[PDB]
Amino acid sequence: HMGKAVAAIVGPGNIGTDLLIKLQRSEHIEVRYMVGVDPASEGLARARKLGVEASAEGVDWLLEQDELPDLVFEATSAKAHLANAPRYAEAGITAIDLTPAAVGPLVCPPVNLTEHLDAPNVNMITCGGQATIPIVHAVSRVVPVAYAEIVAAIASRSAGPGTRANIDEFTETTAAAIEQVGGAARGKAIIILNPVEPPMIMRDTVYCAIPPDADTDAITASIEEMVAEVARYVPGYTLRTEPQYDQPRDIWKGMARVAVFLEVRGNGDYLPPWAGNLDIMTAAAARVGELLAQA
Amino acid sequence: MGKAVAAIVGPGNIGTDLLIKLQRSEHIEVRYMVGVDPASEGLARARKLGVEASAEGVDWLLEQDELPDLVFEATSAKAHLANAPRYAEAGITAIDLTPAAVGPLVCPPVNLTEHLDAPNVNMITCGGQATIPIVHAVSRVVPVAYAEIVAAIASRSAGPGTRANIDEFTETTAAAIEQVGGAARGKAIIILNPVEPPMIMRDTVYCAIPPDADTDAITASIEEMVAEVARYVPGYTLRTEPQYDQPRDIWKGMARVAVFLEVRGNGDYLPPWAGNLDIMTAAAARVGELLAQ
Amino acid sequence: APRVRITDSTLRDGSHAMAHQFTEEQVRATVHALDAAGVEVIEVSHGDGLGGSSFNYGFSAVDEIDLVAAAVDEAVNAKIAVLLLPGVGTVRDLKRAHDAGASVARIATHCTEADVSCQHFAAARELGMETVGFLMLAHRIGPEELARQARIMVDAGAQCVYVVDSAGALVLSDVQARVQALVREIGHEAQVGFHGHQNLSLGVANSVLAYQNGARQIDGALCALGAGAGNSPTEILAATFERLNIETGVNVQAALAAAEEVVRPYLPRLPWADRAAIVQGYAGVYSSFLLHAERAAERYGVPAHEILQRVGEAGYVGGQEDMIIDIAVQLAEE
Amino acid sequence: PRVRITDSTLRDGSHAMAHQFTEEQVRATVHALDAAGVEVIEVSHGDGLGGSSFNYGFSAVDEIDLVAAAVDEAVNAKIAVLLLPGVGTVRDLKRAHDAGASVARIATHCTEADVSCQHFAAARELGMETVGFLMLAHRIGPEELARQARIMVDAGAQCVYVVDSAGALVLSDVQARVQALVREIGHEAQVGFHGHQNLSLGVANSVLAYQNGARQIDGALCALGAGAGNSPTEILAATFERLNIETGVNVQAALAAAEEVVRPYLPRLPWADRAAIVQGYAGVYSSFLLHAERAAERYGVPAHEILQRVGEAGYVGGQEDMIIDIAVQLAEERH
Ligand SMILES: *SCCNC(=O)CCNC(=O)[C@H](O)C(C)(C)COP(=O)(O)OP(=O)(O)OC[C@H]1O[C@@H](n2cnc3c(N)ncnc32)[C@H](O)[C@@H]1OP(=O)(O)O
Ligand SMILES: *SCCNC(=O)CCNC(=O)[C@H](O)C(C)(C)COP(=O)(O)OP(=O)(O)OC[C@H]1O[C@@H](n2cnc3c(N)ncnc32)[C@H](O)[C@@H]1OP(=O)(O)O
Ligand SMILES: [Mg+2]
């Protein structure tokens, strides 16, 4: 498929508007509709400035349009997507869900999207999951990983009320996805909010337990390949140093490990570069969109 | 036969306490109390006790028809330096309770017998009177390479002379620990403690002793000496038995004995917490008694 | 004089100094001694709270909740507290500690981030637990800003909010100002606390000054056992408050004996303000970074105090132990 | 206003070392302190000149030889000596002056300033800077303390310290005493503070002393000193710097001196154990600690019980002999 899929974005907030910018750059997605509920929306205004048909009349209005989109990206809330998801399915519009609703399979583009290319609805996991699951998979595709742990450190100003009200859910959903998508036997996820000014560039550290006799050259090569893959949709996704390998310690219950240190700089589309969490989400969603359009 | 006739020169704390002690003496009659200040209180007390008193000084004393056999001086070093030759010229035996130290330093149960014919004897220091008996009690049994005393007195018992001459206490007492106590080397420390009610005087004596010393014999000698001093200072006591310690590495081969005294005054003129002044007057009275005989 | 309640954190903040290697016997012996001395609240968790066992912070040798259960079993009069850091520990972890018998929930956020704790305070109150909020690294913001965050915690259900000197960086009047601002904002409906570290040898004084400005809860640990150069020593707090004729309910001789006879014999080393710990206090570095920096120092062949100086320059917050490794790698390349 | 730190690693620290300092340790410590910018470095037996004794412990090396080595090593620092009337004498002071000491710190019990007249007069004649120490300053109130400080200034003291010999003063206690001295002598002399760590309050007490007008403060590297130790020099340097108060001491250099020069020779870390805390609580002269530990072993009774009884009795500096009497009593009470 060489064509452009017609898309709608539902939820014209921080994520929706950043996604709009990204999709206007995409080779294979044409944004036709930006859909919200508040007439005074900043995202609706930005869409109209950028030639996109915009409405504060919600999903009701979208589903009334003569030419329905091929794809809808939703960046509203869990409850909103739970309400809208069956409407998209009944109208035959493929949905990419950037909320916690998770009606469809959890996907991470360079990891498990291929097995879900025909799904009517896919879910984008969590922002920290998009940053770290690729690394967990890069290790687990080479050696068994009994335990994988991620530490996400984000600028406080990049944590919106949803993030703040639902911190436990980040740790729980991300750990579960480290196991079901990343391929680790057991997962843990930690999130830290740091208010330093100017706002910090997002950091993510990934620790994987690995056999003591693991081929660390092979693990590094795989990590490097994955980092390059992710970098093709998030150019500011970088390794801060070579993967660090350490033999077993009692403080680690006899596990040996690899530690991978990432810095995730946003592209500065709608959001500032310090909003790497939102930026990787929208970059990953756009990539999932492009792969669904191309399949 | 009778009592020796005595004068006391210096009607202050020590002179007046000595007056009271001597008035209950069976060997000495105090006939004269001599000062320089008419408004003095030792002169007034001597008067209340029927002793002839004068503020006209040693000049007046040496003009009297019956000169004393003995004179006890408790004035100052300067004053006894001035007066000592005058007593010697007049043939009056002198017991010096000042730092003048014209005459040999005596401690009654240690070396007085050597000096019974002396025209002038000196009482060392108050701390020396409390501690030199113990140093001698050890050194008469074993060689003592080093002896150190620690005198702790009630602040209220430290008069202006004591306070202005604190270095001299350490110096003179250390020298007498050697020359009278028999230690090869001496050291003396003095501490003033303001606790209320005022503390009873404490003295600790440390002696270096051979590591194979007969400590039973040392203890017996110390106890014997304490009992001898208690005959003239009833409040002089051992707080505990002598304590022996083995050579620390830093003691370079010598062991130690530590002796803990408490010295309670008799409450004559002075309160019992003035054990420093009281041992001085008790020791001087004893020396005077023996000289009188 | 109004009484002060001491919470002992030998078995929580002290977990950092033990690298989370407490045995059940050590926990029981320490709880027994503290309880008998009259200590009213005894905190028992991984150093980084419930759910802290991790590659990032180190794993507890014994299952975390088993140690809490053992503490509850040993305790006669003391309440057992647990620490929870949102982003690390969850409400599910809190429920597991409540099931084990913990009765005090201490919920800690960075000083600027109180609104991430509102779920935890709600859950703790629903479970019938006494609640305490912890505003970590409290030197990083001013009293006014700190008081606004305390108000968020109290509105969420906190019964006390602590000024937490996680870096041992506060000096006397700095503590006064933060405590007074909190008293002014929340004092009519909640208590104010202080938790000090010994990195500049100011924990005990800061605690006294905190009490004198209206704090009614103060933390210590026996033998100072805790992160960095240690915590204000429980036994010194007890002795000092007694000298000040301020009631704590803690028997001073029993607290001294507990420190000397129970805790001291198991210390891996004495809590001590070495160069590395003082750098933490000077530069405002989270105290629990210390043994992680020492480990990286050895692994990368660079000085721990230089790692910590760099961490100080960068402004990292609690839980950011991973940054130590990045810094150590940089330093080794330099 | 600047503060001048005097370091007493090599004097108060002598107590923790049981007076076993070597010339090499003295030289290395002086070298490090001087290079860090420390302006006055105190070197004597812990009990001051003439302190070497059975009562306090004998020096391994003559303190006058240690003073001479410190003077030889020093480039910018003054070498101070401590002298307690009743222990050390003017003759001892003249030996220290001969060896090159240029600061004389004369210490009396807080109620007994008038025994130090000869010593201040002699030090001034010798051209030495003078500092008066009023020991165990928690034992009397601020105004009584100020009267004694006046006696020292009239005798020739250029600074008088509030000395928390027992590590017993708590915060406002220090404020009150420093204020009273500043009011009484501040137009004429400086005021100082010397704190111990028995209640972990030395550093805070030093900050409050400065804030209430003290211009001289003591510390020791690694807290090396009597009891639980002295306010640590390296922490004073760091804390005053945080407070934007000039000390002239380079913080990194002070930290390195403590960690790399002093720490390696420590017999054990300065530490507020039960016995040291009891000293602060009960108001016991800090140098009693190792002597009480020794008596505890010798008599089979706890050091902290010896020290509690000492505090109750009110013994003053220099009364180490009383530790033995108390230990004998405790041993007998067990029978
Ligand atoms: S990268 C970390 C992201 N955080 C999380 O995953 C945690 C959970 N957060 C959420 O669920 C967020 O609401 C998500 C979906 C992640 C969106 O985050 P934003 O930061 O973009 O949130 P905003 O509030 O800025 O934007 C939401 C917009 O959606 C509009 N909206 C709500 N409900 C609807 C319905 N039913 N239909 C259309 N639009 C809807 C909001 O009004 C808002 O848009 P505005 O136009 O800006 O008001
Ligand atoms: S136990 C510790 C004793 N201390 C010392 O040994 C230290 C040095 N002290 C002295 O030299 C004392 O002056 C002595 C000899 C120790 C006397 O001590 P006091 O405490 O008794 O001193 P007072 O001041 O109370 O008494 C001294 C009396 O002597 C009178 N006096 C001075 N000069 C003379 C002469 N030349 N002649 C006759 N009397 C003299 C003083 O006036 C004073 O008597 P008052 O009548 O009370 O004034
Ligand atoms: Mg802490």
Ligand SMILES: [Mg+2]
């Ligand atoms: Mg001292």
Ligand code: NA
């Ligand atoms: Na819904």
Ligand code: NA
């Ligand atoms: Na996030």
Ligand code: NA
């Ligand atoms: Na005397």
Ligand code: NA
């Ligand atoms: Na201050």
